[PDB]
Design a protein around this motif. Structure first.
Motif, PDB file in Angstrom:
ATOM      1  N   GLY B 140       0.823  -1.207   0.000  1.00  0.00           N
ATOM      2  CA  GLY B 140       0.000   0.000   0.000  1.00  0.00           C
ATOM      3  C   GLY B 140       0.862   1.265   0.000  1.00  0.00           C
ATOM      4  O   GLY B 140       0.351   2.365   0.159  1.00  0.00           O
ATOM      5  N   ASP B 143       1.192   0.368  -4.122  1.00  0.00           N
ATOM      6  CA  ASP B 143      -0.108  -0.106  -4.642  1.00  0.00           C
ATOM      7  C   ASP B 143       0.028  -1.104  -5.793  1.00  0.00           C
ATOM      8  O   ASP B 143      -0.514  -0.874  -6.890  1.00  0.00           O
ATOM      9  CB  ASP B 143      -1.014   1.049  -5.060  1.00  0.00           C
ATOM     10  N   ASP B 162      -4.109   2.743  -9.273  1.00  0.00           N
ATOM     11  CA  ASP B 162      -3.827   4.169  -9.275  1.00  0.00           C
ATOM     12  C   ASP B 162      -5.149   4.886  -9.122  1.00  0.00           C
ATOM     13  O   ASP B 162      -6.129   4.517  -9.787  1.00  0.00           O
ATOM     14  CB  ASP B 162      -3.143   4.646 -10.564  1.00  0.00           C
ATOM     15  N   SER B 229      -2.946   7.639  -4.374  1.00  0.00           N
ATOM     16  CA  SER B 229      -2.905   6.475  -3.476  1.00  0.00           C
ATOM     17  C   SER B 229      -4.224   5.715  -3.453  1.00  0.00           C
ATOM     18  O   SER B 229      -5.265   6.350  -3.391  1.00  0.00           O
ATOM     19  CB  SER B 229      -2.595   6.852  -2.044  1.00  0.00           C
ATOM     20  N   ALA B 231      -3.756   2.549  -1.414  1.00  0.00           N
ATOM     21  CA  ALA B 231      -3.445   1.672  -0.287  1.00  0.00           C
ATOM     22  C   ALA B 231      -3.949   0.248  -0.470  1.00  0.00           C
ATOM     23  O   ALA B 231      -4.683  -0.281   0.408  1.00  0.00           O
ATOM     24  CB  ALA B 231      -3.946   2.329   1.015  1.00  0.00           C
ATOM     25  N   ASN B 232      -3.531  -0.429  -1.570  1.00  0.00           N
ATOM     26  CA  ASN B 232      -3.670  -1.887  -1.631  1.00  0.00           C
ATOM     27  C   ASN B 232      -3.174  -2.567  -0.348  1.00  0.00           C
ATOM     28  O   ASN B 232      -2.174  -2.181   0.227  1.00  0.00           O
ATOM     29  CB  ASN B 232      -2.965  -2.461  -2.853  1.00  0.00           C
ATOM     30  N   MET B 248      -8.553  -2.722  -1.539  1.00  0.00           N
ATOM     31  CA  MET B 248      -8.037  -1.353  -1.631  1.00  0.00           C
ATOM     32  C   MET B 248      -8.642  -0.514  -0.506  1.00  0.00           C
ATOM     33  O   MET B 248      -9.842  -0.269  -0.493  1.00  0.00           O
ATOM     34  CB  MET B 248      -8.404  -0.693  -2.975  1.00  0.00           C
TER      35      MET B 248
END
Ligand SMILES: [Cu+2]
Ligand SMILES: [Cu+2]
Ligand SMILES: [Cu+2]
Ligand SMILES: [Cu+2]
Lengths: 467, 467
Positions: B140, B143, B162, B229, B231-232, B248
């Motif tokens: 994250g 990502d 993205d 961002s 944040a995976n 995500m």
């Protein structure tokens, strides 16, 4: 129908186990009454690039759960390379740091490096003074020991020890005897500081391992001055005050020191077949020698009984036994006479070596470890400390290290450390019938462990009088 | 007379707990049947300059006591500065390493850094494929998530995500909606490798902390590209094969991937009061978009029930609940519909966040964690996974992390990790009447733990289907 591990902890009491982890790089305090780790510290977080967390000892605290202080030292350089671990570090740190750490009721807080304050870095045993006003550290790469002030971390006295062998060849350097010099060691830098941090002072490039006396004699330990090595181990304290005893592995002796007057007073001779003592000769106001006709056996672990009536030194390897002196005369250690030797038919090989020890509070029993290389099971021997005989041996696991004891005398708590790469654990044994109650997880390589003392009296059976 | 801790262990079975220790720099396997740490490893020993040992998952072994394999990743850079520990390494190594480690029946052996092999470095969740022929990692800060082959450690597929916000200001960038791109990554170096190790690809300088969604909105997370961002967090596996789900955090959605065909197929919408799904649009053979009109709440933990009948995604912070889809149709994830939401009056504030989960083998109950910042008691919620309600909540201690379960379904084994500076422990709870049996020492800052599985079937309730 289910068993609650809480029932196990309930019987142990409100005691705090503290242990450093060697190659783990960490130190942890554990609450024996709940099974929780209370806090832990990883020295890498503080820029330590070879955090081999070695020996330690904790000061007495009125309530360990609210706060305690402790000292833990480290080792570095080639000591990183001498276990089973295929370490890959280019340019390790030099170690020899002496960290001061305070548990504040929630976390551990690094206070400072005493080696940087004092200038003196030392890597083997750490003990607390019986007054809890100071601490001592020994080192067997530099062969220096010192007592430090607790409040300022400045050296109170340091002593340096040198070997002058009768035969100038590594194989015979100790066996054919020699003269050991005991030298007052004084600072060089502004501020009354030493210039001995890190590898400064090393005569050999790593601490001698168990049996490593053979490796040095066989020319297999590198160093600037292996022929001059004595492998100092510890500086242990008489619980009665006045005296500190520095142990010397390679020449098989202990030097008794007058702490306040800063002179050595007596040399105790370790091996079976030697007198009680060798003769101390004063060479000038800062220099003593002692003549050792031959070294029959190296020794190692040294310690006082909690009343100071007995002093013990283990012979290791060439002989495997516990040598006991009558130390009852507090006034004059030149009078301390051998009064017993603990032997067992079990002890006739090179291994086991009889190492770390803890007494019961009344001095009637000792727990002493039995160490072997992989893969023989290591364990604990119960010694009758009135008759000086082995009561029992119990088999535990690989690489047994230190013992401590709950201050009520009920439970012996030790560490097994997996030769840095295998099984590691906390072991708990009850002292009423000497049965092993079992094992707690401990993913660490401990070479030390204490239970945080509460009083000056508890110190007599923690990391103060014995290692 | 005395309680032997052995009797506690006896009831647990022959199960092996493994966990990494975050700032401790270590990873350790523990035998629940004896209390022994079986083996531990300190990554500093390998010249790892920022061994934040983060997530991990273990492959099934026919006998974990004789051998098992596992994957453990690391974090670095500014992740070092995000706890209360006053870390002194101002410029730490970059982390993002993906370690392959083998316990061989005696020790842990470091086999390789898969991120160096593949060229792709990822720092958040690690899972095993349900075939045990591979593993996956998410991240994250850059990502990207990827499935890797077990035998060569090379990337099967990697996906980059993205964010293109409707309103170009961090305060509104997620709440006022946007378009997420899903992009197929291809190797750019010789030899099928990526150029994505360490900090390469980072849009932000640390993994978002719990609540960190607010901090990034407030401009308080530094980074090259925080407006981009998502944040995976993870890539979790359908136990039925075929599908992988990427979570995500910031846009509050999960993307379902066809693993064999290497396309995304469906987007699940997390918050209570959004449709089941949003519309996946294909742009070219390597690019998909999904339009999110507003993000009502960030989400976090995602996972399948062990039969694959249900898929869960936790909303965190702005909403605190468990969103549940009917995933019974294995052939077509566009059909998966929301079927329930687990909520509690218990879950009223910002906190607790419900963060990690384990199912019983029969899918009838789930154990899920309740995390709070210091000092509110953290603990475990027991969920009826048939009726979808909270059965029970138990208070444990600080900083609760992951849950695993013994494969017979009898005991839930979790870790608590002291926010890296305070109390840490292993917890055991029996699942028959949901009582905490107690704690075991664990001087580690664990963000993960597993029990080593024996079969593919065990994996359905290990670090494969949930985090
Ligand atoms: Cu020693
Ligand atoms: Cu040691
Ligand atoms: Cu997560
Ligand atoms: Cu984490």
């Amino acid at each position: 129908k289910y068993v609650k591990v809480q029932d196990f902890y309930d019987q142990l009491g409100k005691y705090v186990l503290v242990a450093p982890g060697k190659f783990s790089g960490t130190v942890a305090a554990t609450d024996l009454s709940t099974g929780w780790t209370m806090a832990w510290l990883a020295a890498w977080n503080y820029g330590d690039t070879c955090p081999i967390m070695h020996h330690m000892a904790a000061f007495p605290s009125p309530d360990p759960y609210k706060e305690f202080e402790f000292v833990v030292n480290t080792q570095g350089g080639k000591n990183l390379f001498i276990y089973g671990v295929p370490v890959t570090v280019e340019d390790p740190g030099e170690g020899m740091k002496i960290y001061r750490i305070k548990y504040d009721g929630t976390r551990m807080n690094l206070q400072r490096d005493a080696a940087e304050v004092s200038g003196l870095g030392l890597g083997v045993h750490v003990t607390i003074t019986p007054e809890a006003d100071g601490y001592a550290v020994g080192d067997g790469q530099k062969d220096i020991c010192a007592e430090f002030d607790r409040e300022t971390d400045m050296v109170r006295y340091a002593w340096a020890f040198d070997w002058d062998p009768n035969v100038k060849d590594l194989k015979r350097a100790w066996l054919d005897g020699g003269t050991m010099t005991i030298k007052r060691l004084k600072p060089t830098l502004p501020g009354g500081r030493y210039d001995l941090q890190g590898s400064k002072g090393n005569k050999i490039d790593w601490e001698l391992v168990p049996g490593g006396e053979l490796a040095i004699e066989d020319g297999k330990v590198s160093g600037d001055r292996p022929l001059h090595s004595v492998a100092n181990d510890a500086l242990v304290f008489d619980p009665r005050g006045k005296w500190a005893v520095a142990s010397m592995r390679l020449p098989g002796v202990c030097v008794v020191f007058d702490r306040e007057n800063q002179v050595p007073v007596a040399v105790l001779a370790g091996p079976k077949g030697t007198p009680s003592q060798f003769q101390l000769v004063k060479v000038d106001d800062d220099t003593w020698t002692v003549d050792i006709p031959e070294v029959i056996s190296a020794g190692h672990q040294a310690g006082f009984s909690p009343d100071g009536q007995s002093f013990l030194f283990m012979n290791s390897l060439r002989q495997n036994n516990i040598m006991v002196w009558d130390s009852s005369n507090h006034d004059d250690p030149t009078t301390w006479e051998k009064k017993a030797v603990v032997e067992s038919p079990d002890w006739r090989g090179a291994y086991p070596n009889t190492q770390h020890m803890v007494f019961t509070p009344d001095a009637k029993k000792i727990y002493v470890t039995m160490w072997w290389p992989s893969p023989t099971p290591n364990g604990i021997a119960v010694i009758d400390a009135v008759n000086w005989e082995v009561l029992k041996e119990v088999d535990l696991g690989p690489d047994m290290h230190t013992l401590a004891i709950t201050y009520d005398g009920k439970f012996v708590v030790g560490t097994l450390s997996g030769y840095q790469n295998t099984a590691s654990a906390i072991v708990v044994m009850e002292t009423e019938t000497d049965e092993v109650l079992g094992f707690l997880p401990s993913p660490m390589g401990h070479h030390d462990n204490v239970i945080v003392p509460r009083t000056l009296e508890d110190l007599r059976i923690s990391r103060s009088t014995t290692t």
